[PDB]
RNA sequence: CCAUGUAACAGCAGUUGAACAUGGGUCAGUCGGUCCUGAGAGAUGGGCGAGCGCCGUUCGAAGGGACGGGCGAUGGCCUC
């Protein structure tokens, strides 16, 4: 909705900075950051990448912590896995807000998808070259 | 010892093990040692001994420590 359309919810768009009522601009980033962490936190619960599932993968591969039992795998994973998804989703959402506000190429959003995937195949590229 | 995992050994076997492999576990003023000397062991003095040494353990100028006083303690500058 950029013209002749309902403007209740809309991403900010302007050269430099646009500010008439912050009750619209600051709310957009709040809903964007919260949703991203909400989406990231729920994805691991369904994609089989939570702390509980990772330990089952490591148990299957016969990998253990140095001085912990098998049951303590989950607890050490829970120290980082659940909070990394919540904070990682928040950070990647914040990068989109920074990308959108700065007005980069690609209108900010979408380049985060591009930079990650090109990095995703980078790990293949480096390991296939000794 | 504990947990996890799993040819030789456990005079049969084992999916099991004090076996093998990986990784953990023993927290003290108050429970012990540490202190005492007991039977005894054993230095120093001394004696003996070719000598390494050993006999001897009370048979030698064997005290190194005491609140109290003045020179100088003056030191905090004199309370202790």
Which helix or strand (DSSP H or E) is residue A118 part of? helix A111-127
**What is the separation of C-alpha A119 from the centre of its chain, rounded to a whole number of angstroms?**
15
Question: What is residue A47's DSSP assignment?
Answer: T
Estimate in Å the CA A92 to C1' B75 gap, whole number: 72
Resolution limit, Å: 2.7
Estimate in Å the CA A101 to C1' B35 gap, whole number: 80
* Cβ contact A58 with chain B strand, < 7 A: no
Estimate in Å the CA A118 to C1' B44 gap, whole number: 90
Burial of residue A55 (number of CB atoms within 10 Å: 0-12, 13-18, 19+): buried
Rg, C-alpha atoms of chain A: 20
What's the CA gap between A52 and A77, in Å, rounded? 8
Cβ-contact A44, A54 below 8 angstroms: no
């Amino acid at each position: 909705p950029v013209g002749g359309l309902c403007h209740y919810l809309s991403p900010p768009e302007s050269f430099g900075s646009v500010l008439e009522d912050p009750v619209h601009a600051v709310v957009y980033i709040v809903f964007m950051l919260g949703s991203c962490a909400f989406f990231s936190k729920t994805w691991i619960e369904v994609s089989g990448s939570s702390a509980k599932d990772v330990a089952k993968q490591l148990k299957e591969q016969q990998m253990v912590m140095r001085g912990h039992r098998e049951t303590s795998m989950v607890h050490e994973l829970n120290r980082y896995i659940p909070t990394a998804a919540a904070f990682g989703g928040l950070c990647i959402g914040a990068l989109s807000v920074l990308a959108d506000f700065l007005g980069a190429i690609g209108s900010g959003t979408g380049i985060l998808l591009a930079v990650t995937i090109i990095y995703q195949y980078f790990e293949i590229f480096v390991k296939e070259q000794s």
